[PDB]
Amino acid sequence: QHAQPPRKKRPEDFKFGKILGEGSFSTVVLARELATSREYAIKILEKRHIIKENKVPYVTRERDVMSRLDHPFFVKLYFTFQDDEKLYFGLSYAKNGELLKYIRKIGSFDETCTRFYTAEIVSALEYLHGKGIIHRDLKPENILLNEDMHIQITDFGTAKVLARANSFVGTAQYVSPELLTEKSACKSSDLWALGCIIYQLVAGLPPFRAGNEGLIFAKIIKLEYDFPEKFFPKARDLVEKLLVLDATKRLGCEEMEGYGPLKAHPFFESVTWENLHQQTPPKL
Numbered sequence: 189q190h191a192q193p194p195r196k197k198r199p200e201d202f203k204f205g206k207i208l209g210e211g212s213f214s215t216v217v218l219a220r221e222l223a224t225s226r227e228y229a230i231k232i233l234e235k236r237h238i239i240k241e242n243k244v245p246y247v248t249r250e251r252d253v254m255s256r257l258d259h260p261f262f263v264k265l266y267f268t269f270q271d272d273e274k275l276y277f278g279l280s281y282a283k284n285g286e287l288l289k290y291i292r293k294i295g296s297f298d299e300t301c302t303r304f305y306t307a308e309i310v311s312a313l314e315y316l317h318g319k320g321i322i323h324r325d326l327k328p329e330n331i332l333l334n335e336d337m338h339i340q341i342t343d344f345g346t347a348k349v350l351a352r353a354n355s356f357v358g359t360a361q362y363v364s365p366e367l368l369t370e371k372s373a374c375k376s377s378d379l380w381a382l383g384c385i386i387y388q389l390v391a392g393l394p395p396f397r398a399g400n401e402g403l404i405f406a407k408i409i410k411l412e413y414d415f416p417e418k419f420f421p422k423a424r425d426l427v428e429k430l431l432v433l434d435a436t437k438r439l440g441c442e443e444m445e446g447y448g449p450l451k452a453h454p455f456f457e458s459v460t461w462e463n464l465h466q467q468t469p470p471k472l
């Protein structure tokens with residue numbers, strides 16, 4: 189038996205604070221809701237800018253994708269609202285900012301930290317892919333950290349609810365070869381990005397690097413990268429099983445029977461998967 193279905197906020201309901209970050213079309217601001225004293229990260233878009241650059245569909249898409257997500261390792265969308273000039277997304281506040289910030293400052297994560305944060309990302313992707321959603325812009329800048337230093341994956345403007353997807357979106361360093369050669373992405377495209385990220389955690393920079401996107405693309409499609417010395421051996425093996433040109437041969441992909449075999453990789457031997465979000469992360 190189904191009953192009938194079960195108040196939009198306004199800018200004035202908040203006190204706004206510092207800018208937490210910026211994107212091409214967005215400014216993210218820390219805000220406190222006056223009625224509850226809860227802090228939120230509010231992502232704000234200028235309608236005029238969204239309209240001029242033909243981005244209207246990706247605003248609605250971001251809201252609709254995030255509305256589906258309720259996993260510990262994803263930023264949560266609590267509310268949306270608009271006024272005459274702006275669009276507002278009320279997000280959970282990830283107090284410790286971008287994973288990228290820590291890679292930059294520290295340069296390289298130790299093996300325990302690499303294993304732990306890789307596991308959290310794997311866990312997050314298993315959930316996302318289980319819902320038939322691909323992220324398409326997975327990268328350390330979009331992996332935030334909450335007050336307890338657990339990951340909070342964000343930025344679903346490029347996400348796609350699915351198989352294959354045809355838009356050319358993402359960030360060059362993390363773009364999959366199939367998106368370059370087949371002009372389409374799939375869930376396995378996020379596993380390619382995962383491999384790039386693991387390599388970055390250990391080596392300091394992602395594996396295909398250049399100051400020009402074209403140069404990066406040429407290397408991606410030829411699998412032109414190599415490992416530095418001292419790269420943790422089990423992480424190397426895992427990266428080699430993710431950075432595979434054939435998207436149907438990547439550990440974790442549907443054609444390779446999904447996340448069980450990926451979580452079973454020897455790199456994760458010591459990982460207790462069931463309660464990762466309740467564990468204390470290793471110190472960076």
Ligand SMILES: Nc1ncnc2c1ncn2[C@@H]1O[C@H](COP(=O)(O)OP(=O)(O)OP(=O)(O)O)[C@@H](O)[C@H]1O
Nearest residue numbers: 208209210211212213214216229279280281282343
């Ligand atoms: N929920 C949050 N908590 C804390 N900081 C955040 C949050 N969301 C975004 N930020 C900060 O703002 C930055 C930009 O946010 P986001 O990545 O969602 O913007 P975007 O407009 O989609 O970026 P781009 O246009 O470059 O793709 C983030 O990298 C982060 O530094």
Ligand SMILES: O=C(C[C@@H](c1ccccc1)C(C(=O)O)C(=O)O)c1ccc(C(F)(F)F)cc1
Nearest residue numbers: 235238239244247248251268269270275276277
């Ligand atoms: O999707 C909406 C309104 C939509 C919204 C979506 C994301 C963030 C904030 C609000 C809004 C709605 O009323 O549908 C809401 O959820 O409160 C929208 C998208 C683009 C434009 C414009 F073209 F102006 F840019 C306007 C509204």
Ligand SMILES: [Cl-]
Nearest residue numbers: 199204232274
């Ligand atoms: Cl404002």
Ligand SMILES: [Cl-]
Nearest residue numbers: 204205219220
């Ligand atoms: Cl504030």
Ligand SMILES: [Cl-]
Nearest residue numbers: 398399400401
């Ligand atoms: Cl670049």
Ligand SMILES: [Mn+2]
Nearest residue numbers: 211343345346
């Ligand atoms: Mn974005």
Ligand code: NA
Nearest residue numbers: 311312314315
């Ligand atoms: Na999971």
Ligand code: NA
Nearest residue numbers: 211329330343
């Ligand atoms: Na982003």
